[PDB]
Amino acid sequence: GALTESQAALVKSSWEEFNANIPKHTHRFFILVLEIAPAAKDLFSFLKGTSEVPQNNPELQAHAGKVFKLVYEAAIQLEVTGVVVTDATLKNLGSVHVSKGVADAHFPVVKEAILKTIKEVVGAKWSEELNSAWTIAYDELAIVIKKEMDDAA
């Protein structure tokens, strides 16, 4: 619907299972990115010039870890305040995605890699409720980001 408290708890929980194994789950996420769009390898500074996705790289891990934490924090905010707030950070995030060559058409790629990562994290605990929770938070955060992108390009 638009982030009920039970949806918000499901996101927080799954997020906590994600961050219990950062090395594994962030390796997995980038595999799921290149399986959807092999061309995306080149947008990524620590992926470029590699064969396979590094398994123990700190920059890959800190990056993929901020990405997930931002969606999870958008979902708590949609559930608390009813919106995703535009702040320094997300306007900065609009400029950086612009610099790197990210386009609007790119956003569904990262969406499907997050949904698929999360389904492998929770395993048997996966639900349609959890899936649709992650979907709303992502899509609400991509709107605000794309907005910030667009003002500059």
Ligand code: HEM
């Ligand atoms: C809601 C969705 C998104 C979130 C929350 C997000 C979050 C981030 C964050 C936090 C960073 C690092 C910024 C910094 O600290 O410099 C970043 C960088 C980046 N994002 Fe995203 N991102 C999203 C969508 C996208 C999509 C669709 C693409 C395209 C494939 C993408 C590609 C990149 C690239 C290429 C970088 C550059 C990092 C580097 O090379 O070191 N992002 N994103």
